[PDB]
Each structure stands twice: as C-alpha cells, then as structure tokens.
C-alpha cells in the first residue's frame, strides 16, 4: 500500500506500507528515507496524533492517505 508523508517543511515523500504496520515501523521507514530520528517524529493523520503501539489500521489510514510530520510546542 502506498501512502504519503509531508515533512516539516512541506516536502512530500512516498512510502510503501501495510495497514497492519505499527506507528514505530512507519517511523523507521521515514528514517530510511529522510534520516529523521524516530524520536523526533510526530505524525498527524486527518487531524489526529498517531501513537506508538498503534497500527495504521487503528486510524483508518488507507491507500494514498497522507501523514503529516509536525512540531509539538509549548506555548509561552
């Protein structure tokens, strides 16, 4: 299954995945492509944050869906 991931800047990449894959595994693939350490990765899909230990299928992530890498910041 093909899905997309948008980096922090807005550059889009493509990953081959399976809906049974875990969030940790998807982060490993992002590392292979972009070199981003998994502990720096925070992912959003359709407005929801993706949590370690869950699977893509837990969030109804289907083919051609796009995951978004974001920064989680504390306000002032």
């Amino acid at each position: 299954m093909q899905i997309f991931v948008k980096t922090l800047t807005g550059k889009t990449i493509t990953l081959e995945v399976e809906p049974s894959d875990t969030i940790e595994n998807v982060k490993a693939k992002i590392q292979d492509k972009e070199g981003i350490p998994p502990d720096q990765q925070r992912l959003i899909f359709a407005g929801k944050q993706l949590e370690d230990g869950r699977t893509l299928s837990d969030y109804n992530i289907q083919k051609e869906s796009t995951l978004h890498l974001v920064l989680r910041l504390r306000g002032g």
């Binding site: 959003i44 359709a46 407005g47 929801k48 109804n60 869906s65 920064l71 504390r74």
Partner: protein, 116 residues
C-alpha cells in the same frame, strides 16, 4: 472509477488535518500545541497566535485585561492567551467527517479518517 472515490476521501482527510495543524506563515512548518499559552514560538524564530494563526511579535497581540471568571473581556476583542481551541477544532473536524461520510453514502450507495 475508484480514482474519484480516493480523491474525495483524501481531500476530506487533508481538510480534517488542516483544521488541526497550524502552519508557520514564515517558514511553513506544521505546528501543534501540547499545552501553555497561545503565543507560539516556531523553530524558525517567528511567533504566531495559535488561535487566529496570524504572525505576531509578542504578548501584545493578546487581551491582557483582567477578566471576570466565565465572562469575555469588556475592554477589547483580542485573542485570549489561555483559551484552548482543541474542543472547537474537534467539533469542526467531526462535522466535516460526518458530512463527508453522508456524501460518500449518497455517491457510492464507509468511514473517512480515524474513528471517534
């Protein structure tokens, strides 16, 4: 064909995400807020209001007037430093998903995005 089903579904998914993510107007980086005030400091150095998403230069953007608990400010209409937009944004996201699923039912005789 099935291609239009995919195009509609992903557009809804991306609108659902746009309601959640704040994009820095300076550098384009996607941001979300864990806790704290609505004055955000992007890694690029620019500040933004988490509520109205505009670029700002400090705390002067926000209402700084004393308030009565459970009442809006009687001196200004400026963005509040403390109000949590999470519930309002979730209500927008859920209405978008709800209406989108009703549309796909009309079109194609299925859920979109993560379950509630």
């Amino acid at each position: 064909a099935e291609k239009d089903d995919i195009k509609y579904r992903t557009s809804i998914e991306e609108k659902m995400t746009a309601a959640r993510i704040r994009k820095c107007h300076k550098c384009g980086t996607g941001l979300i807020k864990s806790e704290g005030a609505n004055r955000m400091s992007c890694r690029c150095g620019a500040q933004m209001c988490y509520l109205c998403r505009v670029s700002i230069n400090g705390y002067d953007h926000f209402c700084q007037h004393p308030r009565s608990p459970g009442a809006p400010c009687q001196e200004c209409s400026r963005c509040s430093l403390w109000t949590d937009p999470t519930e309002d944004d979730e209500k927008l996201i859920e209405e978008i998903q709800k209406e989108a699923e009703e549309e796909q039912k009309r079109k194609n005789g299925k859920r979109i995005g993560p379950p509630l």
